Ligand binder design. Structure first.
Ligand SMILES: *[C@@H]1O[C@H](CO)[C@@H](O[C@@H]2O[C@H](CO)[C@@H](O)[C@H](O)[C@H]2NC(C)=O)[C@H](O)[C@H]1NC(C)=O
Ligand SMILES: *[C@@H]1O[C@H](CO[C@@H]2O[C@@H](C)[C@@H](O)[C@@H](O)[C@@H]2O)[C@@H](O)[C@H](O)[C@H]1NC(C)=O
Length: 335
């Protein structure tokens, strides 16, 4: 494992005790401003405990800068992002009739699923917010991922993603390409999250994505705090709202069994029927309509996507104040 070079505009570099490196980059020289479509530079400074990270022990970024995690170059290939082959899913999808949804929430249970082939596999849980299809598919993505080939280790790490052309030539993870504009001075994207304990303490990643009606910029909130936004100018299909929201798990099987014969885990590595504390969940399954109303779709309003149900699957758990989606599994033992 090697560290990438400092990005331009770095005013200070902070080294964490565990080997993490953070570059405090001038908020006006952050990668987003190198995007050809973001020549309209006007930085929307603001929309019209859980975010504190351990690296703060060794320093803070000065005012006017943002913390950017230093990329780790492992020498291993990072596979192309794919909409819900060696990818497997346990996902639910809410399909609106037109691209007018103004936001969506996801409160995702955090785990450290085990990978059978850690140098090539990944396991994630996220939200997908999208509009359009094929070459005009636009996405807004946030969740946690275990991907040693990309991140350098096996911890679940917060990530963002986007594309404006169905992953053909636009988009990337976190701030590794120009796109997402970060406004938050203390929260670095790409850092580890605390995993839940089987039969014990549960940890959650609350994320809320909201389109600003005045600018069209899509703001990201983590546990109610602003992180930054996906500018409307990098998109086409989703500039006025989204037509689809999906939630759930995904694995990538580098062993080539199509995700049908690997014990790489999704969620907690336990099937949904094990329930709270044992199987991973997604709650706050909510979206926002054009009038600003929060929609909480019922279980029968979603389409399920679970192509290897003997390995990874999902189950709704109803009867509580809100719908829970339990998802994931241990995978299927190799034959
Ligand atoms: C669920 O989504 C709603 C709608 O976006 C969120 O509510 C908004 O929260 C922002 C601040 O984060 C306020 O400016 C808006 O006025 C709120 N709107 C409404 C209708 O309440 C809500 O915070 C999200 N909840 C969770 C748990 O993520
Ligand atoms: C835009 O779409 C709105 C929502 O669509 C309806 O509800 C979703 C959940 C799907 O089941 C979809 O098939 C339904 O049609 C409509 O309420 C609204 O009228 C639409 N707006 C216009 C101008 O057509």
């Amino acid at each position: 494992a090697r560290l990438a070079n400092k990005p331009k505009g770095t005013i200070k570099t902070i080294k964490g005790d565990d080997g993490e490196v953070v570059d405090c980059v001038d908020i006006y020289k952050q990668p987003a401003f190198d995007h050809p479509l973001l020549k309209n530079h006007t930085l929307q400074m603001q929309p019209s405990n859980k975010l504190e990270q351990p690296w703060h022990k060794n320093g803070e970024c000065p005012k006017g800068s943002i913390p950017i995690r230093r990329q780790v170059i492992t020498g291993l290939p990072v596979v192309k992002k794919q909409f819900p082959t060696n990818h497997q899913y346990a996902v639910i999808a809410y399909f609106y009739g037109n691209a007018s949804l103004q936001g969506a929430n996801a409160t995702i249970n955090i785990w450290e699923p085990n990978l059978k082939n850690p140098n090539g596999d990944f396991s994630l849980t996220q939200i997908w917010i999208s509009a359009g299809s094929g070459s005009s598919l636009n996405t807004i993505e946030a969740g946690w991922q275990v991907y040693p080939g990309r991140t350098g280790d096996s911890q679940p790490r917060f990530f963002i993603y986007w594309t404006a052309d169905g992953y053909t030539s636009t988009g990337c993870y976190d701030l590794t390409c120009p796109g997402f504009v970060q406004t938050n001075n203390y929260y670095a994207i790409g850092m580890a999250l605390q995993p839940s304990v089987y039969g014990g303490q549960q940890y959650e990643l609350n994320e809320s994505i909201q389109r600003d009606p005045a600018t069209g910029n899509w703001w990201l909130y983590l546990w109610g705090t602003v992180v930054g936004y996906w500018p409307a100018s990098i998109y086409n299909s989703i500039t006025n709202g989204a037509d689809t929201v999906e939630w759930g798990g995904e694995i990538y099987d580098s062993s080539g069994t199509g995700g049908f014969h690997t014990t790489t885990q999704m969620g907690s590595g336990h099937f949904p029927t094990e329930g709270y504390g044992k199987a991973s969940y997604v709650r706050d399954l909510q979206c926002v309509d054009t009038y600003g109303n929060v929609i909480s779709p019922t279980a029968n309003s979603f389409q399920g996507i679970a192509p290897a149900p003997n390995c990874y699957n999902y189950q709704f758990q109803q009867g509580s104040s809100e719908l829970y989606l339990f998802y994931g599994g241990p995978g299927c033992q190799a034959i």
